[PDB]
Design a protein around this ligand. Sequence first.
Ligand SMILES: [Mg+2]
Ligand SMILES: [Mg+2]
Ligand SMILES: [Mg+2]
Ligand SMILES: [Mg+2]
Ligand SMILES: [Mg+2]
Ligand SMILES: [Mg+2]
Ligand SMILES: [Mg+2]
Ligand SMILES: [Mg+2]
Ligand SMILES: [Mg+2]
Ligand SMILES: [Mg+2]
Ligand SMILES: [Mg+2]
Ligand SMILES: [Mg+2]
Ligand SMILES: [Mg+2]
Ligand SMILES: [Mg+2]
Ligand SMILES: [Mg+2]
Ligand SMILES: [Mg+2]
Ligand SMILES: [Mg+2]
Ligand SMILES: [Mg+2]
Ligand SMILES: [Mg+2]
Ligand SMILES: [Mg+2]
Ligand SMILES: [Mg+2]
Ligand SMILES: [Mg+2]
Ligand SMILES: [Mg+2]
Ligand SMILES: [Mg+2]
Ligand SMILES: [Mg+2]
Ligand SMILES: [Mg+2]
Ligand SMILES: [Mg+2]
Ligand SMILES: [Mg+2]
Ligand SMILES: [Mg+2]
Ligand SMILES: [Mg+2]
Ligand SMILES: [Mg+2]
Ligand SMILES: [Mg+2]
Ligand SMILES: [Mg+2]
Ligand SMILES: [Mg+2]
Ligand SMILES: [Mg+2]
Ligand SMILES: [Mg+2]
Ligand SMILES: [Mg+2]
Ligand SMILES: [Mg+2]
Ligand SMILES: [Mg+2]
Ligand SMILES: [Mg+2]
Ligand SMILES: [Mg+2]
Ligand SMILES: [Mg+2]
Ligand SMILES: [Mg+2]
Ligand SMILES: [Mg+2]
Ligand SMILES: [Mg+2]
Ligand SMILES: [Mg+2]
Ligand SMILES: [Mg+2]
Ligand SMILES: [Mg+2]
Ligand SMILES: [Mg+2]
Lengths: 144, 201, 64, 117
Amino acid sequence: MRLNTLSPAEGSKKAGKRLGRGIGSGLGKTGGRGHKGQKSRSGGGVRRGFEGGQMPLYRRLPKFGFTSRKAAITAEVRLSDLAKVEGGVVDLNTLKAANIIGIQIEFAKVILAGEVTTPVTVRGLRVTKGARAAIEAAGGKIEE
Amino acid sequence: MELVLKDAQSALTVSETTFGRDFNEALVHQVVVAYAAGARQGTRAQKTRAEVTGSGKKPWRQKGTGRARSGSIKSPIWRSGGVTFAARPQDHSQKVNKKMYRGALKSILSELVRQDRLIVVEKFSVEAPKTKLLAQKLKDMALEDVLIITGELDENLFLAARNLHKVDVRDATGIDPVSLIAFDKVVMTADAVKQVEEMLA
Amino acid sequence: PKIKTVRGAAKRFKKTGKGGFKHKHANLRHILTKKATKRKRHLRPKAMVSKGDLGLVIACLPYA
Amino acid sequence: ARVKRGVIARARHKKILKQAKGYYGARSRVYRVAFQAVIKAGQYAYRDRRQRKRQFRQLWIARINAAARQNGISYSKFINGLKKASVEIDRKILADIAVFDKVAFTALVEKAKAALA
RNA sequence: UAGCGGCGAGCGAACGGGGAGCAGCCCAGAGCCUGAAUCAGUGUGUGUGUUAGUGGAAGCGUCUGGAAAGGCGCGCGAUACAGGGUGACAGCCCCGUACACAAAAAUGCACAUGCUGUGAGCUCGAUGAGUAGGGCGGGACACGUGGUAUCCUGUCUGAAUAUGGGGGGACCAUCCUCCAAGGCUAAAUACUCCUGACUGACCGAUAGUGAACCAGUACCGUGAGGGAAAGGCGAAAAGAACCCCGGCGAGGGGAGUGAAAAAGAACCUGAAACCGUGUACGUACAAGCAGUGGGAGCACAGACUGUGUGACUGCGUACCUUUUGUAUAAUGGGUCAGCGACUUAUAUUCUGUAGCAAGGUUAACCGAAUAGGGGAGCCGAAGGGAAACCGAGUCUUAACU
RNA sequence: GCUUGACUGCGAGCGUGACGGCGCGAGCAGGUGCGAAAGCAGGUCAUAGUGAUCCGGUGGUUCUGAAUGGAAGGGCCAUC
Ligand SMILES: [Mg+2]
Ligand SMILES: [Mg+2]
Ligand SMILES: [Mg+2]
Ligand SMILES: [Mg+2]
Ligand SMILES: [Mg+2]
Ligand SMILES: [Mg+2]
Ligand SMILES: [Mg+2]
Ligand SMILES: [Mg+2]
Ligand SMILES: [Mg+2]
Ligand SMILES: [Mg+2]
Ligand SMILES: [Mg+2]
Ligand SMILES: [Mg+2]
Ligand SMILES: [Mg+2]
Ligand SMILES: [Mg+2]
Ligand SMILES: [Mg+2]
Ligand SMILES: [Mg+2]
Ligand SMILES: [Mg+2]
Ligand SMILES: [Mg+2]
Ligand SMILES: [Mg+2]
Ligand SMILES: [Mg+2]
Ligand SMILES: [Mg+2]
Ligand SMILES: [Mg+2]
Ligand SMILES: [Mg+2]
Ligand SMILES: [Mg+2]
Ligand SMILES: [Mg+2]
Ligand SMILES: [Mg+2]
Ligand SMILES: [Mg+2]
Ligand SMILES: [Mg+2]
Ligand SMILES: [Mg+2]
Ligand SMILES: [Mg+2]
Ligand SMILES: [Mg+2]
Ligand SMILES: [Mg+2]
Ligand SMILES: [Mg+2]
Ligand SMILES: [Mg+2]
Ligand SMILES: [Mg+2]
Ligand SMILES: [Mg+2]
Ligand SMILES: [Mg+2]
Ligand SMILES: [Mg+2]
Ligand SMILES: [Mg+2]
Ligand SMILES: [Mg+2]
Ligand SMILES: [Mg+2]
Ligand SMILES: [Mg+2]
Ligand SMILES: [Mg+2]
Ligand SMILES: [Mg+2]
Ligand SMILES: [Mg+2]
Ligand SMILES: [Mg+2]
Ligand SMILES: [Mg+2]
Ligand SMILES: [Mg+2]
Ligand SMILES: [Mg+2]
């Protein structure tokens, strides 16, 4: 182990394409751009979703729906997150302190995802049917 | 893990994770390379055809003169024209994940112990701030190219070191993988080794 | 700098569980009375983007 | 990292020019021309290794025809007779024998004639 | 992202969070007590810079060499082995460097202090009207007039005034929050004509500034303006006394200097194109991409093979580009030398590889600084639906086989 | 002659398109018409009779509603 005995893993560093350095290189004269077109040109090419002029798919098809502002402030909790908090009470504030839900999160739901072993008291949160059953089995409590 | 000491011939227990792990060469190499990249300064710049000092007028008319068609005197294919892809000052600093860095350090430390390049001692203080004294001590310890890692900061030791280019005295907080690899031997004080273990975990 | 989204594409497409894109069918917007009810019914539900245009959609929506 | 390219460029040119020694005019003096000439020579050499094989066989056949006729038999007939007689002597050797050993060639011809009829 | 947008191309927040820095005041006014805090100028004293500077360690012998700083021996200094010179590469030869000191005078910044101006605290008040709103036309807000809140105003109007008024994205009610139409205010932020120090996986004379050189010069232009080329003898001029040819030339040959003048100022090296002198071989009956395969002779070098030439002979219409297709009478190149074109930054995806793994990782910033802190955030572990919402399901539908 | 199947929700599975799409479809649920009944009927013997998106208009709505309650605007469904 000297500064002239170390070496990278095989496959770590790969050879960097150098365009336009002669015939043997492979990427010879043209540099893998074929022969004179728009794409051949420096700066050449066409913007995203351009189809020669055809009405592009993102325009062909109709716009739909709207964005909900309450969805931005809802969140979804896991039973593994019911264990990740500290204590035995799961409020919004407690979850936030734990760092599980985001700060501007008015509402949260406990979903049956993962598993809860310790007894936990879910207070003031919506809980899905499977999650509620799981928590009860764990020996927990849910209250509004 | 257990390192016997030179001065007292007494053992010192350490973590197997820190001082007895495998040497992951690829990881170590990446970390050292990153260190070098970070150390570079990267201050340079050429002039693009934009920046080269001159007028932006057409040297001669597009057609007629029979000369090849020229547009600017600052062209990159002209003598005293711009550099085509002129450099700017750039930051060559690579990120290294904390865990990756720590692992690399662990591997290097382990390698040193295996290779018998890590020498542990109870204390490596010099009495005066005198290069002559430090040199004599090193000779007595048999050493020449060495990184003396100390726990607590020592003024006499640091000053004495200053003029020996083969010798380098560091605080245990300021160790770095390139330095460890570079220096022929590494002499850690007992406090320093303990501190390093605490740091690395 | 950050790549910008094609906002029209964002409006018209939404990503699914594996990484497809559902979209609303064309032709159910105006003159309807001539269109047959069966056709209208079929057009009503959403539809996955085909294999051909998936790439184009992906280019349009880099943060989708 | 300004890689000046004088030394390499000149070495490369010099190698090509050296290869093009002995060519008339700019084909031995002026790089562009010399290089063109060198490439051409290479192409010719490849062709002519093949053509060399062809030519020498042609020469051997001509010599053997002359010798066989001197011994009163055409080349084709002589070759057929030899083939019949199971003589595997190849025609480089046959030509050499004809040139330098008339008795041996005559003996061979006799064998061919006997085998033929 | 939400939004804006021929809903195209594109533009693009805020709320909220983490940091840097954090300083609050005064007038619309008078009574009291009143030189009371603060701020500014101005003298004086102290401290610390700045504008000259001082000291600053320790090596000789031998070999090669023009010369030692190199080789080989044996020593010494080092809070000084940064750096630069000196006849080749020097810790100890010189200048410095670490470190310790220094200002008659002028002056920056601190306090301390004197003088001048400056006015603190209490009670009672007062609380910015052609203004806020509005109509018309524009503009600014991410916001293009749209359902468009908010800000500015060219034009025409025009309130209430704390029992009051503004905002909370058309608008109304409730609730919350603030007080416009008067001002001042350090820090964290931006930049470098200029001054000093230091640094570079920056250039090294076609590069780096246009300019290493008497360069914004020569030169060009009426003018605004454009705008070059051009570095190197030697360690030291020791820069060639004297003689000779020559026009009391130029130029050269000796001589001398020097390590070297094929280092002589047209000066380090001194390539290529291009032009000569000499020698070997070939060539004046022979038709073309000028080579290549075969190949005689001749010359040379060694003891037959190497080299040089190439009579004669088979085959053989350059290169690039562009094209269905070029010897093409299609393009480009007089040649040489130097330079001349897939880069960089940031986002995103896939592949390899390393780390950790249901977790991974930090950004600004802080930091005896590539350590460590910082988890604000971001991606992932759950999807369905336009959405409310539901959730290993969900949407469709009255319900789904 | 009697009628409104010129139904509503869906739809195994196929055809045809680079795609946008276009076409055929037994069967299931609801509710109907003719037939004594078996049955047939989701327009016409079939193949032309047509126009994406955007931007709006009209009606409905158990979605949304920028402090809160509404509303505007947006969405969804039908349609121009
Ligand atoms: Mg290739
Ligand atoms: Mg190829
Ligand atoms: Mg390509
Ligand atoms: Mg081309
Ligand atoms: Mg073409
Ligand atoms: Mg092309
Ligand atoms: Mg361009
Ligand atoms: Mg958080
Ligand atoms: Mg002009
Ligand atoms: Mg330049
Ligand atoms: Mg860090
Ligand atoms: Mg509609
Ligand atoms: Mg001095
Ligand atoms: Mg000194
Ligand atoms: Mg010496
Ligand atoms: Mg020299
Ligand atoms: Mg006021
Ligand atoms: Mg107004
Ligand atoms: Mg208004
Ligand atoms: Mg207002
Ligand atoms: Mg509101
Ligand atoms: Mg040069
Ligand atoms: Mg220049
Ligand atoms: Mg110049
Ligand atoms: Mg005269
Ligand atoms: Mg003279
Ligand atoms: Mg010389
Ligand atoms: Mg010279
Ligand atoms: Mg020459
Ligand atoms: Mg002749
Ligand atoms: Mg001729
Ligand atoms: Mg020969
Ligand atoms: Mg020939
Ligand atoms: Mg072609
Ligand atoms: Mg043609
Ligand atoms: Mg041809
Ligand atoms: Mg031509
Ligand atoms: Mg060409
Ligand atoms: Mg030409
Ligand atoms: Mg990439
Ligand atoms: Mg990867
Ligand atoms: Mg009936
Ligand atoms: Mg018909
Ligand atoms: Mg449109
Ligand atoms: Mg419009
Ligand atoms: Mg409507
Ligand atoms: Mg509501
Ligand atoms: Mg509301
Ligand atoms: Mg509504």
